[PDB]
């Protein structure tokens, strides 16, 4: 089948980026290498924004989870890998890893099902 809507993550904390996006295959997954911003964050912000439009912060906000494990880093060095698996039922498994201490956390977020 195809996703119920354009799925993507929020980068730069506040912007909407697309990863899965509607009109794709439900059984999808991918691990990309993104960088962090603001030296000395010691924590990355991975927001799951599922939508396709200009100026987000209004579309379907999947979920928000806070990561940690990137001590004082002048950008570029931080290594965050994001994997997103979409299931038939309508779930998304997001995970961001940090390269500085070996910290990583994962969370499950229901795409759009409900009743």
């Amino acid at each position: 089948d195809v996703t119920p809507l354009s799925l993507g993550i929020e980068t730069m904390g506040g912007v909407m980026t697309t990863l899965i996006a509607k009109n794709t295959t439900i059984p999808t997954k991918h691990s990309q290498v993104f960088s962090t911003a603001e030296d000395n964050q010691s924590a990355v912000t991975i927001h799951v924004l599922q939508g396709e439009r200009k100026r987000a912060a209004d579309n379907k906000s999947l979920g928000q989870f806070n990561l940690d494990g990137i001590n004082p880093a002048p950008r570029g060095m931080p290594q965050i890998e994001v994997t997103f698996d979409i299931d038939a039922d309508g779930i998304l498994h997001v995970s961001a890893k940090d390269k500085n201490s070996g910290k990583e956390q994962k969370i499950t977020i229901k795409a759009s099902s409900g009743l």
Binding site: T11, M12, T17, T36, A37, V44, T45
Partner: peptide, 7 residues
């Protein structure tokens, strides 16, 4: 093209 800022 896309980084990752916190708040």
């Amino acid at each position: 093209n896309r980084l990752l800022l916190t708040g």
